[PDB]
Design a protein around this ligand. Structure first.
Ligand SMILES: *[C@@H]1O[C@H](CO)[C@@H](O[C@@H]2O[C@H](CO)[C@@H](O[C@@H]3O[C@H](CO)[C@@H](O)[C@H](O)[C@@H]3O)[C@H](O)[C@H]2NC(C)=O)[C@H](O)[C@H]1NC(C)=O
Ligand SMILES: *[C@@H]1O[C@H](CO)[C@@H](O[C@@H]2O[C@H](CO)[C@@H](O[C@@H]3O[C@H](CO)[C@@H](O)[C@H](O)[C@@H]3O)[C@H](O)[C@H]2NC(C)=O)[C@H](O)[C@H]1NC(C)=O
Ligand SMILES: *[C@@H]1O[C@H](CO)[C@@H](O[C@@H]2O[C@H](CO)[C@@H](O[C@@H]3O[C@H](CO)[C@@H](O)[C@H](O)[C@@H]3O)[C@H](O)[C@H]2NC(C)=O)[C@H](O)[C@H]1NC(C)=O
Ligand SMILES: *[C@@H]1O[C@H](CO)[C@@H](O)[C@H](O)[C@H]1NC(C)=O
Ligand SMILES: *[C@@H]1O[C@H](CO)[C@@H](O)[C@H](O)[C@H]1NC(C)=O
Ligand SMILES: [Fe+3]
Ligand SMILES: [Fe+3]
Lengths: 348, 348
C-alpha cells in the first residue's frame, strides 16, 4: 500500500482529488465523505490516510490520536531567502468583517445580529469568535447569541443554520462542505457581501482575495475593500488595511494530519507531489496544480505557496499551541461533539 | 545442468510437461507448483529453470531478477515470407467482451456488474482493465468495484472469487491454474458465455477461437460471435470484428523467462525442441506437439506458431515496454504481494 489515500470533503474536492490521483500515477488516491468529521473517522479507521485541516478540526483529529504532518505556508512579509518548505510559518489573522455602510455595528452590539461562519469547529469561523463571546457573556448559550447564522455543521433545524443556502437547487443546507453556498472562508465572506449576514468570521486574507478585482467570481467581481470594515475587540471599527491592529486572534495554519504509523510515508509522498504540482511545480500548470481550484480552496487554501515541515516531533497540542488548545477546551465545555465524546478516553 | 527444468502450473500442465520430457529424452524435465507465483519461486530457488508467462507474470518474474528468453508468436496478418522465429511479434488485443443482449452495459456502466478475469496479475484479465478502472475512479478499491467476480488468484473468501467454480467436484475454487473452470483466456470467456458474469476481460483471439464452431467444446460449440460485443474506452459498443478500433490496450506476447545465467542455454534448447515438436515439428504430430493441449493453452497458447527471438539483450522492462510497466507499477501501488516484497529484499 504505497498509495496515499487522500480524504476529499464533498464532491468538488473529490473531482480535484481524482485529477490529483490520475496525474500522480496513483501515488495518491481518493476517499470522500460529506464532512470533515466523517473524513477524520475514515483516517481513524485506515480507509483513508490524510487530509488538510483547519486548526479547529486538527484539535478533533488530535483528540482521536491523529498527528500533524506538514503545514500550509503562504508568502511571508520578509524572507525570500529560505526555501518555502523550511521557512517559518506565519499564523493567519482571524477577523470579524462588516459592511462599512452598517454604522452602529461594533463588537459590543453583535448580540442578536446575523452572523456568517466558515463552519462549526473551524478556527476563524468559530473557535476564536464564539470562544470570546462565551468568555465575555459568561454564558454557554452561544447558540442563542446571534438572532440567525449560517454556520455549516450546526444542527440544520437550529437558528445557527437559518441563513445557509445549500446547492443551486438549495439541497444540503448547512452541510459543512463546498457545495454549501456560504461554506468556508469564501462562503462566509460571500454571506456578508450578499448582506445575508451583518458579520462574517473569516481571516484577513479572505477580504483582500475577494475584493478589488482580485477574484473573478460574479458575486466578488465588483466588490471594493472600502465598503468593508474590521471589528476590533476594543469596540472600534477600522479599514481592512489595519488587520494587524484589528484582529480577534492569530490562527495556526491549516495542516495535513495522518495516523502516526503513516505520517513519514505521507510526508515523503507530499514533499514530492508538491515538487511536481506545487507553486513552482515541474508539472504545474500544464498537467495539474495542487494549490489551485476554481478559487474555492479545495483540499488546500489557493494562497498556499508550499506545505512546510514542522518542528521536531509535534503533537496537535504543540502545533496549535497551549493557549489556543485551552481556548478550544473551554468553548468545548459548553457543547458536545460526537467525535470528541467518542475519542475522549484516548487522551484521558 | 544440461537438463532444462520446465515449471508446470497445475497437474494438467504437469502431464503435458512429463510427455514433453519423455519425447525430449530428458533434454527437458518437469517441476510443478499449484500457481504461477509458486513456479517463479522455484526458478528463483534454482529448483526449476523456465516457464512461459503472461506479460503481467513477466513483471513479477522481472522484479525477482528473471529475464525473457523467447516470445510466443502467432500467425500474423501480412508476412508468410520471413520464418516465424525471425518474424516480428505483433502482440495481442486486450478486450472487454459482453453479451450483445445485455443492452445498456458500456465501459461507463461497469460499476457493481459481475466480471470474469483470466486471473489476478495477467495482462488482459487484470492489469489492463483494473489499471484503467483504478485510474478513472482515482480509487484503489478495485476489490469492491465489481459486485462479484471470478479472478483466480484473488482471496478465495472475497467477492473477487465469488463466481469461480473450481474443478468438476468444486474443489480449489479460484486457484490460478487450469483445473479452475473459469481460469485463463478460455475460462474467463466461458464465464461470460454461461452468463456467470456480465463482462469477460480476455484477448481478441479468445472470442474468435470459441465462437462459430471454431471450438468443439460443448459450452462453446453453439456460440455465435454476433451474440457478443466489445466495450470501447469511448463508451461505445462494437462487433468482435472491429477489435482493432475497440480494444483496451495492446498486450506484449506471453514469453519464456529464466535466470540470467540460464537464458542462452534455455534459448538454444527450446529452438531445438520447437524444431522437433513445434507447428511444423519433425515429430509433430506423430510423437508430440508442443503447441497443442486438450484445448487448454497448457505451457503455451495453442495459437502459438513458434517461439521467436527478441531484440539484443532485453530486460523485462524493454520487453513489456515503458508504458505497460508504468501502468502495472501504478496499479500495484493499490496492493501488496509477498513475492514482490521478498524479491525487493533479495535483488537489492
Ligand atoms: C510517484 O512516486 C514515485 C515514488 O516516489 C516517484 O518516482 C521516484 O522519484 C524519486 C525522486 O525523484 C526517485 O529517486 C531518485 O533516485 C536516483 C538514484 O537512483 C537519484 O538520482 C535521484 O536524485 C532520486 O533520489 C526514484 O527513482 C523514483 N522512484 C520510483 C520507485 O520510481 C514518482 O515521481 C511519482 N510520480 C508522480 C507522477 O508523482
Ligand atoms: C492580509 O491579507 C493580505 C492578503 O494576503 C496580505 O497582503 C499581502 O502582503 C504581502 C506582504 O507581506 C504582499 O507580498 C508581496 O508580494 C508581491 C508579489 O505578489 C511582491 O512584490 C513582494 O515582494 C511581497 O512579497 C502581498 O502582495 C499582499 N497581498 C495582497 C493581495 O495585497 C497582508 O499581508 C495581510 N495582512 C497582515 C497584516 O498580515
Ligand atoms: C482477432 O483474432 C482473430 C482470431 O485469431 C484474428 O483472425 C485471424 O486472422 C488471421 C491473419 O489475418 C487469419 O489467417 C489467414 O488465413 C488465411 C488462410 O487460412 C490466409 O489466406 C490469410 O493470409 C491469413 O493468414 C486467421 O484465419 C484468422 N482466424 C480466425 C479464426 O478468424 C484477427 O486477425 C484478430 N484481430 C485483430 C484486429 O488483430
Ligand atoms: C488516467 O486518466 C487520465 C484522464 O482520464 C489521463 O490523463 C491519464 O494519463 C491516465 N493515466 C494513465 C496511466 O493512463
Ligand atoms: C537432446 O539433446 C542433445 C544434446 O544437445 C541432442 O544431440 C539431441 O538431438 C537431443 N534429443 C532430443 C530428443 O531433443
Ligand atoms: Fe482556518
Ligand atoms: Fe496474457
Amino acid at each position: 500500500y504505497t498509495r496515499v489515500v487522500w480524504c476529499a470533503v464533498g464532491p468538488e474536492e473529490q473531482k480535484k482529488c481524482q485529477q490529483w490521483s490520475q496525474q500522480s500515477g496513483q501515488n495518491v488516491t481518493c476517499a470522500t465523505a460529506s464532512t470533515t468529521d466523517d473524513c477524520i473517522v475514515l483516517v481513524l479507521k485506515g480507509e483513508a490516510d490524510a487530509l488538510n485541516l483547519d486548526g479547529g478540526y486538527i484539535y478533533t483529529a488530535g483528540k482521536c490520536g491523529l498527528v500533524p504532518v506538514l503545514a500550509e505556508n503562504r508568502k511571508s512579509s520578509k524572507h525570500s531567502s529560505l526555501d518555502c518548505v523550511l521557512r517559518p510559518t506565519e499564523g493567519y489573522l482571524a477577523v470579524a468583517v462588516v459592511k462599512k455602510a452598517n454604522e452602529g455595528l461594533t463588537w459590543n452590539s453583535l448580540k442578536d445580529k446575523k452572523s456568517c461562519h466558515t463552519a462549526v469547529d473551524r478556527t476563524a469561523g468559530w473557535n476564536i469568535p464564539m470562544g470570546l463571546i462565551v468568555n465575555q457573556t459568561g454564558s454557554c448559550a452561544f447558540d442563542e447569541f446571534f438572532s440567525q447564522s449560517c454556520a455549516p455543521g450546526a444542527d440544520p433545524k437550529s437558528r445557527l443554520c437559518a441563513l445557509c443556502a445549500g446547492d443551486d437547487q438549495g439541497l444540503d443546507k448547512c452541510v459543512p462542505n463546498s457545495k454549501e453556498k456560504y461554506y468556508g472562508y469564501t462562503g462566509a465572506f460571500r454571506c456578508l457581501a450578499e448582506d445575508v449576514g451583518d458579520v462574517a468570521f473569516v481571516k484577513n486574507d479572505t477580504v483582500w482575495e475577494n475584493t478589488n478585482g482580485e477574484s473573478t467570481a460574479d458575486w466578488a467581481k465588483n466588490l471594493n475593500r472600502e465598503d468593508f470594515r474590521l471589528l476590533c475587540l476594543d469596540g472600534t471599527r477600522k479599514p481592512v488595511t489595519e488587520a494587524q491592529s484589528c484582529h480577534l486572534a492569530v490562527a495556526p495554519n491549516h495542516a495535513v494530519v495522518s495516523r502516526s504509523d503513516r505520517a513519514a510515508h505521507v510526508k515523503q509522498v507530499l514533499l514530492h507531489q508538491q515538487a511536481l504540482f506545487g507553486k513552482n511545480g515541474k508539472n504545474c500548470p500544464d498537467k495539474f496544480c495542487l494549490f489551485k481550484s476554481e478559487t474555492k480552496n479545495l483540499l488546500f487554501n489557493d494562497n498556499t505557496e508550499c506545505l512546510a515541515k514542522l518542528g521536531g516531533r509535534p503533537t496537535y497540542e504543540e502545533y496549535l499551541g497551549t493557549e489556543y488548545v485551552t481556548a478550544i477546551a473551554n468553548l468545548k465545555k459548553c457543547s458536545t461533539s460526537p467525535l470528541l465524546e467518542a475519542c475522549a478516553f484516548l487522551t484521558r
